[model samples]
Target chain A: MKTAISLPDETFDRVSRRASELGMSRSEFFTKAAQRYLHELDAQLLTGQ
Target chain B: MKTAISLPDETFDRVSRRASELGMSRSEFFTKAAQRYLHELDAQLLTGQ
Candidate 1:
């Protein structure tokens, strides 16, 4: 799914830098970050069970 | 694409608690956290420009 979002100039630069550092595109970086976070939460939920 | 990862139990619990307090789904909380972290970094980078 393609979505649009508005980000501050600084955020764009920072995200860009991090993405480059990780050799990922901005979208890929963001997607992976979110996914990683979700994974953490899922694990925690499972542990709490 | 979906992938799997491992996390510490404490980190998972913390994230889960925070997400619940914020009334956000685990995925949503993590997504926002990553976006917010990127935004902060972006702002810092822009400032250095």
Candidate 2:
């Protein structure tokens, strides 16, 4: 899905810099970021199941 | 920064529903999410400093 999200310019710049340092595309970096957050979120909802 | 990011269809849907459920705009939800991920990310770079 293609969507637009507004983030702070600083976070935007930071994200880009990290993506370059990690040698990955922004798409990959974002996917991983979303995945990690969702993983923890779901885990918290389940609460050690 | 106003930019675009592509996430999975499910995640896109889930995010929308979450924003609605949480009673906020996509922009607010995304900003909060980004803030959270970046907060810990920066922390990791500092390693407990």
Candidate 3:
């Protein structure tokens, strides 16, 4: 999806710093965050069964 | 939170059955349905994005 992820400036600053600390580029961090997100959806689905 | 009326067994049954078709329990179905519903509201807020 070509959606923009927006947040308050301070929040973005915090997230950017954390992403850097995690040894990843900002886009890489967001990509991994998205992947983890889908995994979480699958996990939630499994728990419903 | 706001006031809510309990669904009649029939409506609940319909929702539960639909949830089951989607592979979910009653509670899981209702909650996720509501969560998805909130996203729809968010979409509307975002100009139906």
TM-score of chain A of each: 0.62, 0.61, 0.68
Q: Which one wins by DockQ: 2 or 3?
A: 2
- When just chain B is superposed on the true chain B, each candidate scores a TM-score of 0.70, 0.64, 0.61
For candidate 3, lDDT tens digit of each residue in A1-49?
Answer: 2213334465556556656666766555444443443444565588889
Give me the candidate number with maximum TM-score: 2
lDDT of each: 0.56, 0.69, 0.47
Those runs of model 2 whose alpha carbons end farther than 4 Å from true positions after fitting are A43-49, B38-49
The DockQ values of the predictions, listed in order, are 0.06, 0.48, 0.03
Compare candidates 1 and 3 on TM-score and give the better one: 1
For A1-49, candidate 1 gives per-residue lDDT tens digits of: 2323344556556556777888966656655665565555565578799
Residue B22 miss distance in model 2 (angstroms) = 2.9
Worst ten-residue run, lDDT, model 3 chain B? B1-10
**Each model's total of backbone clashes:** 3, 0, 0
CA lDDT, candidate 1, residue A6: 44
Name the DockQ score for candidate 3.
0.03
Among all windows of 10 consecutive residues in model 1 chain A, the one with the lowest summed lDDT is: A1-10
